Structure formats: structure tokens, C-alpha cells
Paper text:
At the inner surface of fly photoreceptor rhabdomeric membranes, the master scaffold protein INAD (encoded by inaD for inactivation no after potential D and contains 5 PDZ domains arranged in tandem) forms stoichiometric multi-molecular complexes with phospholipase Cβ (NORPA), Ca2+-permeable transient receptor potential (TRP) channel and eye-specific protein kinase C (eye-PKC). Our biochemical and structural studies demonstrate that INADL PDZ89 forms a supramodule and binds to the entire C-terminal coiled-coil domain of PLCβ4 in a manner that is strikingly similar to that of the INAD–NORPA complex.
PDZ45 binding stabilizes the conformation of NORPA's C-terminal 16 amino acids by extending the α4 helix for five more turns, immediately followed by a four-residue β-strand corresponding to the PBM of NORPA. The binding interface of the PDZ45–NORPA CC-PBM complex can be divided into three distinct sites: the PDZ5–PBM interaction site (site 1), the PDZ5/CC packing site (site 2), and the PDZ4/CC binding site (site 3). In site 1, NORPA PBM (‘EFYA’) inserts into the βB’/αB’ groove of PDZ5 following the typical PDZ–ligand interaction mode. In the NORPA–INAD complex, INAD PDZ45 binds to one face of the NORPA CC with the two PDZ domains crossing over the α2, α3, and α4 helices.
Numbering used by the authors:
A (entry chain A): 862 to 918, 926 to 1016, 1021 to 1095
B (entry chain B): 478 to 591, 593 to 671
The structure:
């Protein structure tokens, strides 16, 4: 192309949408929806009973119905704790099973970008060589235009002066290409970093969501 | 370290956490309704934020352990994860409370069927902040309400600093038309990516 290649970053979100992960991620997503189907039926059942009993018992709200409704607001929160623990258990399990394979996909996707850039760099060299080959042709054709075997000394001297211009151009473009390569590779190193830490943060967040809920669901009711 | 946190001024506090849950409901994120900053909408009593006894509702958390809290470049899950992460010592925050606290007040309405509502409410002194919203039922809340959106009225009844049993009962009544007054924080933006 005309502009340099811009590569999309390799994130956890991008990997889920990759083609290789599909055979695994679908099965994992399938497990969640069935278990969430199991969960969804149970809250529906518990909601029917709770909503059918609360219709029995006015705007006094000082009666011995206070221990009854917080009996509901106790048992339902206990059930929900069971639900979310089952969910977090499965999610962590999905992470363990897929963990090594995802590292592998990122390495492979990043390798693809390296090859893409490498090919792009190859075309740039071919382009420079074409420009330089036309340069050599232009110097020979111009020597046939002017006059002054007696005039061949200037063409050979022009050749001695072009190889120097050519050798330098090759030197400097490689430097630019190598920096592009180094910058791209560093991007990949950071991606691997942020991938690993984001997963760590996820698990930790589950730990803290789980822990906070024990003293929090008591302050919550379902409507 | 610890300061006074006067309103309409950025105060840097040092709040001791020590691996303990902070227990707050925050709103923020690029995929969120609150795109102008991170604002506390509920504080839980058993959490460390209530244990600090310095953060009321509608306080804009601009920074969090040396991390500027910009909601424009972070998803809602990333902003929520900031408050649900393990911290070993006192966390350094830059908090911006206001008087008057910057907020937009809108309204919501619908009709009920029986299908439960799908909202888990936690009564606050301001109202009832939504702790968990179930997608897939009653689509209106799906496009208007969110975890962090506080409900200040129900069937014309205000929920300002009400007991737990009363709010549970009146929400359980359902059986017809419904109407809720909501408050969402629309704070002045105060950070950059």
C-alpha cells in the first residue's frame, strides 16, 4: 500500500472473535446458557411463590410481617449466593481450560502481523530497487545524449557516484524498517502484558464481588 | 493523608482498605449512560467506603490510587472493576463533591404484567439505587435504567431514606401502571485520556 500498515491491537476481546477460538468459545458459551437456563427457571419459581405469598398482607408496616418479609429477603439472597457461586466457578473453570490456548492464539495472530509487515517491507525494497534501476538507465541514456570511448570516463564516474547513493539508500531504509519492526514487536510485548493482567484482574474482581455480596445481599431485595 | 473533602473542590484522601471490599455502586464508562465521569450512587454500610464515613452519594471520583478515572476510554466493566479490586493499603483518591451536586433528573413509566420487574434495589438516603438489572424482560428499563441509576419515586411514592420493609412491600405490589422518578449524575468532566 501507499500508507504504512496500521495493525489492530490483539486484545482479549479480539481473541474471542477470532476464528480459531470458535470451537472452544461456543461450547463454553453453550454451558453458560444452559446453567443460566437452570438459574433462570429457579428464580422464576422462587419469584412466583414469594410474589404469591406477599399478596397476603394495608400501610401500617409495623407488624410481625417484618420478620416474614425479611425471611423472604433472607432465603432469596441465600439462593442468589448459590447461583452466583455456581456462575463464578464455571467462569474461572472456562479461563483455566482456555488459558493456554488463548496465549497460543495471540502469539500466532501477532506472528501474522509480523509476516504482514515483513512482506510490506519486502515490497518497499523492490520499489526502491525499481527506482534505482530506472536511475541507472537514465544515467546511461543521458551519456548517449551529451558528447565531449573518450567520453566514457564520466559515465563510469557517475556509476561510482550512484553506487554510493544506492548503498546509502539501502542502509537508511533498513534502519527505518528495523525500527518499524522493533516498534511492532514492542506493541506485541505490551499486548501480552495487558492480556495476562486483565485476566488476573477479572479473577480478583470475582473474588471481591463474591466476598462483598455476603454482607450486601442483605441490603438488597428483588422487585 | 486524610483531608476534609469540602464540596466543589478536589480533595486528595487516603482511605485505608487493606484487601477489603469498598462496597460502592458507581456509574461510569464509554458504554454507560454516565459518560462525564465516575460518580458514587450508593455506598454499602458493611463496605470500607461507609467504614470511611467520608463519601456521600454524588461524589465524582476523578482519581483512584494514582489512576485518573476517565470514563471515556474505559468500559463500564473496567470502571466497576476499579472499585472491586483488592487493595493492600490506604488508597489515594481525588474526590470532587459539589454543592449543588451536579445531576440531571428525568422520569420513567410503564405498565406491569404477570413477569417480575427484574431490579434488585438497595435503599439509600437518596432513593433506591439499582444493584442488578435483568435484561430480556420489560425492555423499557433496558434502554433507560442501569446499575447505578437511583429511583426516587414509585407509584407517586418517594423512596428517600425509607425502611427496607416498606420499599420491599410497595415494589412488590405491582398490579398495573408504574411510574418512577430517576436521578442520573451528569457531572462536569474533570479528566483527560
Amino acid at each position: 500500500a501507499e500508507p504504512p500498515l496500521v495493525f489492530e491491537p490483539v486484545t482479549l476481546e479480539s481473541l474471542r472473535q477470532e476464528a480459531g477460538f470458535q470451537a472452544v468459545g461456543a461450547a463454553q458459551i453453550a454451558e453458560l446458557d444452559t446453567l443460566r437456563a437452570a438459574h433462570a427457571a429457579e428464580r422464576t419459581s422462587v419469584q412466583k411463590t414469594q410474589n404469591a405469598a406477599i399478596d397476603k398482607l394495608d400501610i401500617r408496616n409495623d407488624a410481625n410481617i417484618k420478620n416474614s418479609i425479611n425471611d423472604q429477603t433472607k432465603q432469596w439472597t441465600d439462593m442468589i449466593a448459590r447461583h452466583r457461586k455456581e456462575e463464578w466457578d464455571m467462569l474461572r473453570q472456562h479461563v483455566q481450560d482456555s488459558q493456554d490456548a488463548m496465549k497460543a492464539l495471540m502469539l500466532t495472530v501477532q506472528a501474522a502481523q509480523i509476516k504482514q509487515l515483513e512482506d510490506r517491507h519486502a515490497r518497499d525494497i523492490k520499489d526502491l530497487n525499481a527506482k534505482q534501476a530506472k536511475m541507472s538507465a537514465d544515467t546511461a541514456k543521458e551519456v548517449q545524449n551529451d558528447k565531449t570511448n573518450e567520453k566514457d570516463r564520466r559515465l563510469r564516474e557517475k556509476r561510482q557516484n550512484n553506487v554510493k547513493r544506492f548503498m546509502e539508500e539501502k542502509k537508511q531504509i533498513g534502519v527505518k524498517q528495523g525500527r518499524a519492526m522493533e516498534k511492532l514487536k514492542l506493541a506485541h510485548s505490551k499486548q501480552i502484558e495487558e492480556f495476562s493482567t486483565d485476566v488476573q484482574k477479572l479473577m480478583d474482581m470475582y473474588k471481591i464481588e463474591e466476598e462483598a455480596y455476603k454482607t450486601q445481599g442483605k441490603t438488597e431485595f428483588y422487585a | 493523608a486524610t483531608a476534609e473533602i469540602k464540596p466543589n473542590k478536589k480533595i486528595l484522601i487516603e482511605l485505608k482498605v487493606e484487601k477489603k471490599p469498598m462496597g460502592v455502586i458507581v456509574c461510569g464508562g464509554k458504554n454507560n449512560h454516565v459518560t462525564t465521569g465516575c460518580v458514587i450512587t450508593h455506598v454499602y454500610p458493611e463496605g470500607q467506603v461507609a467504614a470511611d464515613k467520608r463519601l456521600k452519594i454524588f461524589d465524582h471520583i476523578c482519581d483512584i490510587n494514582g489512576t485518573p478515572i476517565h470514563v471515556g476510554s474505559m468500559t463500564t466493566l473496567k470502571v466497576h472493576q476499579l472499585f472491586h479490586t483488592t487493595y493492600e493499603k490506604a488508597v489515594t483518591l481525588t474526590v470532587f463533591r459539589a454543592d449543588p451536586p451536579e445531576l440531571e433528573k428525568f422520569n420513567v413509566d410503564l405498565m406491569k404484567k404477570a413477569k417480575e420487574l427484574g431490579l434488585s434495589l438497595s435503599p439509600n438516603e437518596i432513593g433506591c439505587t439499582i444493584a442488578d438489572l435483568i435484561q430480556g424482560q420489560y425492555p423499557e428499563i433496558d434502554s433507560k435504567l442501569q446499575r447505578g441509576d437511583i429511583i426516587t419515586k414509585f407509584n407517586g411514592d418517594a423512596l428517600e431514606g425509607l425502611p427496607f420493609q416498606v420499599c420491599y412491600a410497595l415494589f412488590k405490589g405491582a398490579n398495573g401502571k408504574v411510574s418512577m422518578e430517576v436521578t442520573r449524575p451528569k457531572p462536569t468532566l474533570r479528566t483527560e485520556a
